């Protein structure tokens, strides 16, 4: 089984693996904050992100796909599964400061993952990627 990804309207990216489906969005809103949220410095720490193994596996699959190095790259955040706001994880994709090299490798990884990828992140501005559960669209490949 291989996760399949479909893009609709060239602005939103949807990935479905198994029974788990996510929607990837880019904006400057910092939904997750490092002070109060789980830090993913090791792939085994993602068990705190969800109660469903499908969401954990699909999350781990995506970071492996974009070339995320769990021990060299900046750690990303995810919401503690004990909270009720819902599943989400957030990667800093801002092309600025010391995060420049990682942000540039993330753009390369997305461009190889999705054939049509609109890079919303602009140089010098904060850009935060967030993947949250969503109902799988019936208007995109199955």
């Amino acid at each position, epitope marked *: 089984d291989l996760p399949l990804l479909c893009t609709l309207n060239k602005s939103h990216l949807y990935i479905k693996g198994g029974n788990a489906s996510f929607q990837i969005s880019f904006d400057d809103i910092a939904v997750l904050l490092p002070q109060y949220d789980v830090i993913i410095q090791h792939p085994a720490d993602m068990s705190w992100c969800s109660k469903s193994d499908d969401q954990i596996w699909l999350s781990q699959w995506f970071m492996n796909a974009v070339g995320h190095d769990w021990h060299l790259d900046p750690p990303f955040l995810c919401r503690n599964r004990t909270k009720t*706001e819902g599943f989400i994880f957030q990667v800093n994709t801002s092309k600025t400061g010391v995060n420049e090299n990682y942000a540039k490798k993330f753009k390369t990884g997305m461009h190889h993952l999705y054939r049509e990828y609109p890079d919303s992140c602009l140089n010098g501005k904060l850009c935060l990627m967030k993947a949250q559960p969503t109902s799988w669209p019936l208007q995109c490949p199955l």
Partner: antibody
Amino acid sequence: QIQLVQSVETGGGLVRPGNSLKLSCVTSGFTFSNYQMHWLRQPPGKRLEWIAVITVKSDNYGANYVESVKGRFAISRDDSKSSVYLEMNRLREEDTATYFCSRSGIYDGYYAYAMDYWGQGTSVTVSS
Amino acid sequence: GSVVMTQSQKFMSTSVGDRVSITCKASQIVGTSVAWYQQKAGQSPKLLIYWASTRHTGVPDRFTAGGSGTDFTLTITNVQSEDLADYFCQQYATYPLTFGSGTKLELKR
């Protein structure tokens, strides 16, 4: 029209210390099952304080409570009745406040606990 | 261990058509996860903005908010008589959700 009505199932707002009171909040004008529900009490002359939250049917009806309230209150919901309830046991005199039910939706595409709409509130006083 | 939201001015006197800013101070950094509400005579609160600066659909154009980190301000331009109410902030970045002390908006005479 996204109307939230609060009522008391048993008796009135006044209750004696150590007794149990159940608060019922009925919603209308929107799909109750889609959004999460919160309970909030406001003490007289004090700031508003969060009490509890219950999530939708997609999640296994999970809930979260505050520390002072853990082990004494229980939040519940009925999608068919489209109403959220708050069962309060071993009530202490500190619990005297006006209780509110509120709805939280999706804000700029992300789940957050900002309160969309509120109930009118029921005054709850506990004394001897 | 719980973030507290303190408002320096418990009461603010203003006139119709004036500009008024209400400041919210957080004990810890809450980033952008801040909302503002309005409450009249102890009735049900009404959401004004969310995510620090995103105005709610029902809210009129007069209300504008902003801020990041631990400092958040809510400004009202061309204040009307119906704007005289209570205003308080809220953070939803961490449990438990905590609200501000509150500011009352009063008319000069």
